[PDB]
Amino acid sequence: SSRRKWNKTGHAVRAIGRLSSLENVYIKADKQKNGIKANFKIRHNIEDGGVQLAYHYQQNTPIGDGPVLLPDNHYLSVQSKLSKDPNEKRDHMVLLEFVTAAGITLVSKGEELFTGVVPILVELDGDVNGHKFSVSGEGEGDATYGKLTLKFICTTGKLPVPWPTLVTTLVQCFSRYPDHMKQHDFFKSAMPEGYIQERTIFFKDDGNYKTRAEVKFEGDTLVNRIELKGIDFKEDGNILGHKLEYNTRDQLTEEQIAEFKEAFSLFDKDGDGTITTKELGTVMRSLGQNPTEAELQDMINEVDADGDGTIDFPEFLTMMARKMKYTDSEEEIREAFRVFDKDGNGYISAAELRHVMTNLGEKLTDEEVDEMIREADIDGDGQVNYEEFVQMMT
Numbered sequence: 333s334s335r336r337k338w339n340k341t342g343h344a345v346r347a348i349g350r351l352s353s354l355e356n357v358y359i360k361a362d363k364q365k366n367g368i369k370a371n372f373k374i375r376h377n378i379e380d381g382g383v384q385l386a387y388h389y390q391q392n393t394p395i396g397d398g399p400v401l402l403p404d405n406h407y408l409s410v411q412s413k414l415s416k417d418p419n420e421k422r423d424h425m426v427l428l429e430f431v432t433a434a435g436i437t438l439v440s441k442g443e444e445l446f447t448g449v450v451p452i453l454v455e456l457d458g459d460v461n462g463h464k465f466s467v468s469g470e471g472e473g474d475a476t477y478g479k480l481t482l483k484f485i486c487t488t489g490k491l492p493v494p495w496p497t498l499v500t501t502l503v504q505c506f507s508r509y510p511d512h513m514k515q516h517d518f519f520k521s522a523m524p525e526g527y528i529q530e531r532t533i534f535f536k537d538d539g540n541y542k543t544r545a546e547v548k549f550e551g552d553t554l555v556n557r558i559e560l561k562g563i564d565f566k567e568d569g570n571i572l573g574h575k576l577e578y579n580t581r582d583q584l585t586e587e588q589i590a591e592f593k594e595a596f597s598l599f600d601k602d603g604d605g606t607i608t609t610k611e612l613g614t615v616m617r618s619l620g621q622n623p624t625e626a627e628l629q630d631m632i633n634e635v636d637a638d639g640d641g642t643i644d645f646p647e648f649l650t651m652m653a654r655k656m657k658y659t660d661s662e663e664e665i666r667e668a669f670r671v672f673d674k675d676g677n678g679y680i681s682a683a684e685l686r687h688v689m690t691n692l693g694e695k696l697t698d699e700e701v702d703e704m705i706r707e708a709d710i711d712g713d714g715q716v717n718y719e720e721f722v723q724m725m726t
């Protein structure tokens with residue numbers, strides 16, 4: 333019951349950390365190229381702990397002359413699930429993804445090509461630090477639901493980088509745009525003739541990928557043909573060392589749902605099943621921060637799938653599930669620590685933890701605070717240090 337009070341307060345602090353970061357796929361118009369650009373950050377969990385970040389910069393430009401839709405700023409929100417085919421002997425990846433557009437609060441001819449199930453083919457040739465490879469993929473897309481299902485095989489044998497590092501490179505035309513956002517769908521507007529998609533992908537503390545792809549219909553089939561070049565990777569880093577987790581570790585016990593609901597209720601103080609800017613502002617002040625109305629709006633917008641300007645319960649569950657699927661960076665975890673460690677000395681004291689609990693509205697007398705400090709205090713100094721916090725947080 334003191335482990336329930338860490339869990340709750342921890343989840344709240346994590347929720348605020350999610351709402352204050354930029355996890356989606358940000359798309360903007362690029363009038364000079366009659367297309368778009370994007371930027372986003374991908375997290376690759378490192379198998380023995382930690383996260384490997386990959387910073388993406390993207391440009392798309394139409395292959396044809398016909399007119400295209402240039403969007404207002406918005407984002408795509410991706411849910412990916414990687415798995416293995418138990419009968420496949422070759423080095424491979426099975427991928428299932430659901431992609432939805434959002435970020436604009438409350439139809440081109442190309443879009444007609446996507447109203448049913450469309451076969452897909454993908455072909456990639458790569459070269460990373462001189463290690464060459466090829467990948468072929470096939471499956472289908474159902475843009476009505478933002479859905480893709482694909483299987484990929486490394487046709488040259490063993491893949492010299494981890495599969496997850498290639499997911500972004502391996503058809504954003506299959507995204508589901510909501511009815512109020514159909515005029516911002518560049519990708520389908522450019523079909524059937526297609527677009528060129530280019531990226532540079534920076535793997536933090538390591539090398540980079542450069543990619544160029546052509547995405548277009550070839551008969552009935554939507555084809556993505558790509559070349560990729562990787563340079564400057566460390567032979568012992570996460571990429572060439574194969575130190576990244578493959579598998580989407582996507583639990584969500586009913587128990588975990590229940591813990592997220594408890595943190596939800598800390599925000600949703602009128603119990604109506606949705607969090608407003610007023611409510612989010614209340615929580616953040618009480619934790620020491622002082623956001624403006626604009627920032628609170630932008631925070632909500634980051635996870636506001638229906639665009640009504642509030643975070644409803646299912647939208648909060650979705651946000652929290654994703655925040656637990658991928659590991660936080662050391663900078664992020666330190667930030668969370670600093671919410672508690674108010675004097676910055678590296679130690680959460682009983683006094684500091686009371687101050688946060690008092691301030692967040694809990695009745696908890698000196699007594700139970702102690703009980704909480706004690707629960708987390710591994711080395712018995714009567715305080716919680718960074719490493720004890722990191723553990724209390726998993």
Ligand SMILES: [Ca+2]
Pocket residue numbers: 599600601602603604605606607608611
């Ligand atoms: Ca509410």
Ligand SMILES: [Ca+2]
Pocket residue numbers: 636637638639640641642643644647
């Ligand atoms: Ca909403």
Ligand SMILES: [Ca+2]
Pocket residue numbers: 673674675676677678679680681684
């Ligand atoms: Ca302190």
Ligand SMILES: [Ca+2]
Pocket residue numbers: 708709710711712713714715716717720
């Ligand atoms: Ca301690």
